[PDB]
Symmetry: C2
Subunit: 989 residues, 2 copies
Amino acid sequence: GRSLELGAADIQDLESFEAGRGALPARAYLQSDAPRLSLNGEWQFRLSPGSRVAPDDGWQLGEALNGFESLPVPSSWPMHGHGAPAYTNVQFPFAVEPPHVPEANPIGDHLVVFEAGPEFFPHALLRFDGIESAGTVWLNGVELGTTRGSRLAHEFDVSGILEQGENTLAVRVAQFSAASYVEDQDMWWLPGIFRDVTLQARPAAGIDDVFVHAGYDHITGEGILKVEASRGGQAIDAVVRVPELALELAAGTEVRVPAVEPWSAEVPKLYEAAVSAAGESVALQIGFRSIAIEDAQFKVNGRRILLRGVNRHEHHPRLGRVVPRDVVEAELRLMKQHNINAIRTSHYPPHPQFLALADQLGFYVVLECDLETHGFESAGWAQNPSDDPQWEDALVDRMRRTVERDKNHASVVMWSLGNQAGTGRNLAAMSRWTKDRDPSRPIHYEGDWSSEHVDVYSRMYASQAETALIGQGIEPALNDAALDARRRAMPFVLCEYVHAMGNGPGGMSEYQALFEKYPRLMGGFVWEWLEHGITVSTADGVDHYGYGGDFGEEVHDGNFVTDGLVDADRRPRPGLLDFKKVIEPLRIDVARDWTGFTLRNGQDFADTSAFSFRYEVEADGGALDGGTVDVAPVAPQSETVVELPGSVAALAAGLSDGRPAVLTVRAVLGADSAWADAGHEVAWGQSVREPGAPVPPAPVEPVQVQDSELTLGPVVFSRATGMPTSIGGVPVEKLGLTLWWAPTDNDLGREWGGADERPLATQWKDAGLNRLHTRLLGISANPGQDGGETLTVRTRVSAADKQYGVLVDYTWSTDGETVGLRTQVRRDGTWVNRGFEVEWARIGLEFVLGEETELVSWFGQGPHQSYPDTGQGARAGWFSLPLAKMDVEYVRPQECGARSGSRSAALQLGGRTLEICGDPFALTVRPYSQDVLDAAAHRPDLKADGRTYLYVDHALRGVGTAACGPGVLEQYRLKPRDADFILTLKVRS
Amino acid sequence: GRSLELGAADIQDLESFEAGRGALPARAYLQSDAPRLSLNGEWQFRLSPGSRVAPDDGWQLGEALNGFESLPVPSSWPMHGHGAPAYTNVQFPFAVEPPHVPEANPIGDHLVVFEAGPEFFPHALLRFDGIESAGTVWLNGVELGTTRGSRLAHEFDVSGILEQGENTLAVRVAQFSAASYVEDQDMWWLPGIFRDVTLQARPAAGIDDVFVHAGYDHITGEGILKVEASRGGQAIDAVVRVPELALELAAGTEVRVPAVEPWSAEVPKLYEAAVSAAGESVALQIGFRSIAIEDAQFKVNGRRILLRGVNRHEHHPRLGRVVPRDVVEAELRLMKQHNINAIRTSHYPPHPQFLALADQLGFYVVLECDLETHGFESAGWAQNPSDDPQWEDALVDRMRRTVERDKNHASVVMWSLGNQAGTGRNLAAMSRWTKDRDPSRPIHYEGDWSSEHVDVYSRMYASQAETALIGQGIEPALNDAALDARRRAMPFVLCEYVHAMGNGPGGMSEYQALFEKYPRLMGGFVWEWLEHGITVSTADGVDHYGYGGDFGEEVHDGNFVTDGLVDADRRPRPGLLDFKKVIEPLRIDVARDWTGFTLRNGQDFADTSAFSFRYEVEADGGALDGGTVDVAPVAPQSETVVELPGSVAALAAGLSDGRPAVLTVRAVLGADSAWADAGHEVAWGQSVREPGAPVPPAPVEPVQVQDSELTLGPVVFSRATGMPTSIGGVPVEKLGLTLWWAPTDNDLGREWGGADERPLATQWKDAGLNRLHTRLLGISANPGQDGGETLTVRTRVSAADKQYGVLVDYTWSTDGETVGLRTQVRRDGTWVNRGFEVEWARIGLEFVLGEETELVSWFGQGPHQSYPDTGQGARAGWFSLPLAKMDVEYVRPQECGARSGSRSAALQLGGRTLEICGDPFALTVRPYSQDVLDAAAHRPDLKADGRTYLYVDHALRGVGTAACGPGVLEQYRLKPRDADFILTLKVRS
Ligand SMILES: OC[C@H]1O[C@@H](O)[C@H](O)[C@@H](O)[C@H]1O
Ligand SMILES: OC[C@H]1O[C@@H](O)[C@H](O)[C@@H](O)[C@H]1O
Ligand SMILES: OC[C@H]1O[C@@H](O)[C@H](O)[C@@H](O)[C@H]1O
Ligand SMILES: OC[C@H]1O[C@@H](O)[C@H](O)[C@@H](O)[C@H]1O
Ligand code: NA
Ligand code: NA
Ligand code: NA
Ligand code: NA
């Protein structure tokens, strides 16, 4: 019969399996002297909820615009009130039935008027560097075409459509399209024209495309240069000038430069070049380097390299997918400042401006195509576009555009087909296309472990153990003997490892030792550089980051998008401070006798001439000595023993026994670089003269007994509970055993393997670890010394409904000045619950004091937190921080702020100071309780209550990376056990 | 050394394994002419948080009372502001380490001054009928003793301690003691002196104990009477008078009464008797009945009986464990009014006054000892007191006191050792003790399935299938051949079945048919009679019930305590209305031709003389005919065919085809009974002349097309969505498919068996059933009739991230007056998620109307809700209720209120009325959405939004009893399938 539905045609276009239509051939992004006009600025924007109600009212013509309001472009429009951001990880936010699209599909109509001078005639084009996800483009009312591939560039010919003077550009953007099925990255869904829009003139006798080939003969030191130039796809005559190298050559001819300085992330040497035809000149930066796979090793310029990498998404906490250039420059500088040398453009090509910065600052780049079909996995990959022939042209297009845009950049050392897209015919087609087009760069793809269509073997989150087996070449064989032979000849990369969500990542050091030991291991890229937090405010206007669910999403994945080394505003997390140290390119081992240090240059190409080597001896009262020592340049992968000045060793010999002192040797920048100023720290090592264990105070002065209180020097006990009620005028509200901490994001993740896959957080809750109860068994005084008396308080700790417990005995002693506390812990019964062994977070004490703390000082590791499998970046020394600065501003509050390896601590409580000494303990000080910390979903929920929560831990569990990847390694697990530890306390007024 | 802890002695007493000390021998509760004074009234009360701080300040003497305030006694003191109620099911609220007690142990000091006249001298006693959990008792400063067994009676001799005139009674009650380990019932923890306190004189030549033996010879009709009387444990001479039977006999001699009328729950004949010694007379009610197990059947007075039972806890929503006498009488009347004939005193003996009411109203009683160790189960029963020899005397005591108190009551037909206490030596000792003491009553205990120490085979929540196998005697054998032979000779009882939590219970009819078919099946007792809800109010003072967690509990079990047939205030839930019908003691099957009905007397002893048999024919406009028919008494377990007056059949023959009419036959009380008034309904049956399927309207008048709307008679469609936007001026805000409902408590329970034990609620959430999305595929008009046109709207329904869907096509038609809606549903793809088949809650439509509804009327089943496996109590007829009265006030809001079997419906929306007809559909009407219903944890969270949510379901799932016991039976499950159904709509103004 009849057909009455609306918008069927717009929707049928959105449901297209094809690439964009009407676009010029894909080419490089080129700096050209051709006239250009940026259309970035204030556009007009109208939002309709779906195609069926998007007006077809000739709005493209620019006149009589009702419903339109101002909107900046580039933009991610949900970041400007229009709709809301939405976060899913794997799950699609719409029903999975490709190529169909939901009825709720935000449609954004963009319109801008601009002036086209005569220099854009006769020929010109319009360039869009990114539209998420489907663009339709009209100029002065005529349709130029459509765009597909949200992070890829499209160029449309406007010759004979651009009119001199006023022009009107109209763009209809659909959030969802068939392309959404192939853009399922773990990140926010954010439609918009989110990258540059540019009018460019195309002069006659110009240059459309250039393909730089710049190799390096590491034996002769020769460069191998060929620069290809074309117009309309055909090779053209052009001249290539490289002044610094005294070169003038024809485009299209290979020459041998007698001697070039080769490009690497370490020494990113770049030669300025120009490719000139009659009507247009293109300016290039040329880095001479050759990539090769040899002996199951990934080599640049003849050397195996070590990738110290991160996964870099593009995200801004207020602008969405638009990352301003000053943020890009700052964050790339920040990466270099933390010894990073490699970037994976997870999981799509970056802004085109990124590539020149990577060339200049020096990163080995894995440039990744915009392709991810992860949400088909949950259905056994049924309908996976990667293996559906109908999607072949769309996916080859995506790969073509990815390669063509960035093929001229030395920093790109690998092409990646995409991410988490399964296996399939279209991936093979993308590989063959890339391999034919650009043999000079190995192909990467992790989704197909057989590695049939790639040149490197890539995995995500392989455990340290499996990595060690791969490093030795003894991983299990593939069933296919041919494929196994190929894959065993491949070097191995962790495209994602040590997931950096919340407190953590743990186990980074164990990976690094393998990277150093085994040449086949190329290194690894941390998942991920940044947290995708989005700024939002509450009533009082206090700012904080939002995550999945905080924007009304029907389906989401919560804080899983906040999984980074820096926050959305690029403030480092402790994991980055640790990472910087783990990947430091020099190793400095200070001799115990302070006569010198062993120095190993862990770089691949550079020597140590860029570094100044500094030493300082610090003591309780500050610096005793310091200076700089001169070090003959150490070659890459070599080592030497540097003598320290004799005054240092002599100072060590003169220290009275038990006086703590720390010798630190640092390698800093001898001069300003392009990524940091002179004096910036790159590497360091220490040797510590530990303080002698604190003398327990003689048990002098007998305990005083009263009706309800007991008194032992400065300590007052409740005779009912047997617990201290004040120490030296400091009110104590509670003292008890701790075995639990507020779960980290890692603790909320499933630990696969074994019959028990409950997250540790759930194991703890089931076991009652968060709700310990204490029963008093007895209190007794015993002869001490010369009248004095110790006080022993015996308790048992358990939880409601459990038969297992620990016996905890506190023996107190005092000489009137310092208080001696010995704690003994003994397992009672079998610590099994729900059929599995219970594990502990800690063995420690919680002191709850009835006064606030202004300042915390300690001798130990710092300044930032450290847990058994983290804190590589925490060095030995003396530290002091205001209470608030002891905390860590994770988006979801969780256990954090512990300072492991403390020998002494001092809390300033108003006018008094509480001092704690003893054998190594971890230190934590909070203005709120653990229950307040666990309950909080965002930082504003953390309310101070005027108390001080002081945690002193004899033992801590590790933090691992169980949110995604390995849990805590065996050596850092904490099974129930017996324990004993001494402390001394003292209050100064 | 020294020992400084406080309260060690009080705590060591609380940790005692022994029974109470200093108490008189256990005896019956006896109505005596001895002087008595109740000390119930306003006592003084002081609360301390534990033994170590409970003052030892001579408070027992009554002078200088600081910290004391007024408190009524009996009381559960947390119900009066002192502390808070706390609910755990299985889990103990304290660490499990018997006999030890937590430091947080509320200690309640009770004190009262009273006057003792001379009639309490020389000898007297003090009687406590219940103290939870540990009592210490002083009178005028001297310690009488202690109490253990919280629901058991203790009596202390006060001779020479009671002083003439003023006396001061002091009682220190500890909430927790070693006894708590054996009182772990699924209920609130509520300390207090919660039952009577009584001063009783003990005259010389009195009677301390009496033991009535009153058997019945069902062959001769003789009574067998022996009344034992004792003083100080020794048999004494007394005279027994039974006037009605012309008997005067000696105590201690067995006589044969020539003819007695025997006692049963159906005919609770009681003979008044007095047992008199010189100094005291005891008044008794004697019911002659004999209990016997024969041929694997439980028989009373020579007949197998059917138990129609409930589990009766003692709970009051504002007074806790104190249940006022008028509530006890009312609720027992209410039970009889719903055909219940049996009570299990779950899981402790009731108030002593209960036993006379049960004798008088008529219930077969399972009287259960106060014993439950359920919380040791989770540890493999390690340390279970039931098998720990140190607990033998305490547990034998409990059983002794239980039996001695109530052994004289005919209503007690079984003794139960306790509940969920595992297996063990002490249970065997309790059984042997009871068996020696009172052979006249079989022993019940469910915890030991081997049944070694019991006389009946008892289970909880055995499935209908397993019950059928037990009923046939073909359940699997025990390993022990001797024990198997014993158990197979036992009749079988479900001490708990068809858990009545929230919407439900389902599957009651399938159990009942087995009880009727198989003599070995004794029947069953529903878990439980009442919800243990506790009254609380919010800001505006609106009252509602609280459950676990609503009182600050650290560990609890939420609404699992609200699992009853009536609410805390004894308002019936729909499950009780269904239960009443399922267990109705007469079966009335009305003949299709309306000539008569088959009547089966399902009683065990009584005939049908107590019933008046009434008929009524009702039609659309009300009653057409009615009257009473006389029925010659039908013997128990017999049946007959009763003719109806010829006018009834003739009326059926005269009905024009399609005119609905309902013949109902009811058996009501011919005269007032002791539990209801004359006319009270006991049983009923119906025969319905169904209305003819509604004629679909001729598809006349063609559909009108506009830019954004389509019009088809009274219906206006949105051309974008293709859905109605108004019908006859009634705004329609949404129309779509439903497959999901707000989970019931049953849906939140694990369905054991199979690899999938996710609750159904979780299966639905994982599957996206609660978040369906609809895509429009096409809208088309088609030739109807004489110009007219149908309108077909094709849609697909799925959910985000899922590949499965349903195709839903709506074909609309109208003649200008009525609207015809045909809906077609077709499965698209395989409905599997997380590896398991998805099940649906329903196949229906949700109409969301933009106006409120005042009234709902329908022809179908009613007046209360009905689901496929419930609604036995809903009868056919015409019903009309205000919107609010369509809802069901479950404590936790959940799916409820559906009216299955509807043929027509009418919603009054202000001035207009919306009418729905069609083949059988279920009807639900709410002022709030399903998401609001699912989110709500208490009724105050249900906010009306001014809309009407109308649900019309072609198919519904059952509700089952999966919260505890069987899920939905196979025949009521709802697997994805294709479906089609027609409806007609019409708006009257
Ligand atoms: O012009 C349409 C097509 O032209 C091809 O030559 C080119 O490889 C593609 O980039 C595509 O855009
Ligand atoms: O390419 C084959 C691989 O595919 C992955 O998706 C899978 O998780 C691996 O176990 C491996 O089989
Ligand atoms: O008087 C103490 C004991 O006396 C026994 O004769 C009696 O069986 C028990 O009830 C117990 O109370
Ligand atoms: O008495 C033996 C029984 O004990 C129960 O606790 C158990 O759940 C049953 O499976 C049965 O073994
Ligand atoms: Na992914
Ligand atoms: Na938290
Ligand atoms: Na229980
Ligand atoms: Na709910």
